[PDB]
């Protein structure tokens, strides 16, 4: 019911007319399950079940936007500390409103 397809000698021919099923690469293919396939389809196409609810907005804001806000605040604090550490004047960052034009330290200058 089966036969060896591969030939190391190089005399390989595919027996498409052979009564016996070749032991080709498809021999070892996984059989698969109907419900697992539908679970895969459901999980990939989870945007179909997306619904805007106040709970969904709450979750998205509190975790994603919350983490962005926390990271931005921490980065701003670190920049302020580094400016105090280095001796630089308060730097004009994009959303900080500063009446100083200091952006890039002059290498030649001693701070």
């Amino acid at each position: 019911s089966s036969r060896i397809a591969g030939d190391t000698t190089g005399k390989y021919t595919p027996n498409i007319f052979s009564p016996e099923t070749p032991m080709d690469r498809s021999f070892s293919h996984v059989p698969k399950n109907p419900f697992w396939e539908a679970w895969v389809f459901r999980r990939d196409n989870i945007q179909r079940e997306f619904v805007w609810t106040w709970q969904t907005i709450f979750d998205l804001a509190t975790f994603v936007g919350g983490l962005y806000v926390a990271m931005y605040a921490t980065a701003s604090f670190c920049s302020r500390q580094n400016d105090k550490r280095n001796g630089y004047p308060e730097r004009n960052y994009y959303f900080s409103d500063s009446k100083s034009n200091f952006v890039i330290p002059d290498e030649r200058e001693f701070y």
Partner: protein, 147 residues
Amino acid sequence: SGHPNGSFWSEGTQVGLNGFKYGEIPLPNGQPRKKLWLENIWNIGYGGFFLGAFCLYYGAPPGHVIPSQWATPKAKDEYAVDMKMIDKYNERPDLQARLSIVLKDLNMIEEEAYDLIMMRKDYKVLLGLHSGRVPADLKAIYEELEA
């Protein structure tokens, strides 16, 4: 149980192939397996890459592949000069006071005194002295320690 013949130093009980490497079946008469089309080209090309990389990493003159190799002797000479100068700085307290005045104008703390001795020949100090940012006393202080 135990060992097969009762002796640990007896011939192995398994004759044949433990497994089929790459899944290939040994030929009946001992005929060698025909080599794959890519084997020669693959070995030549990738072995050439690795051999050339080895040769260039080790054969090449210093500073050609690894720039830091070039700097090693120059750093030795600079280390000797810096050693002499820092030793002279520790001995002479009059120079310490002058470098204290130089440091303050450069917004540097006193402990950075060794640092200034180590940045004698650098973009910052060399150009600041020309421009006027660095006090001209630093030139004389450097010279008094044999430059």
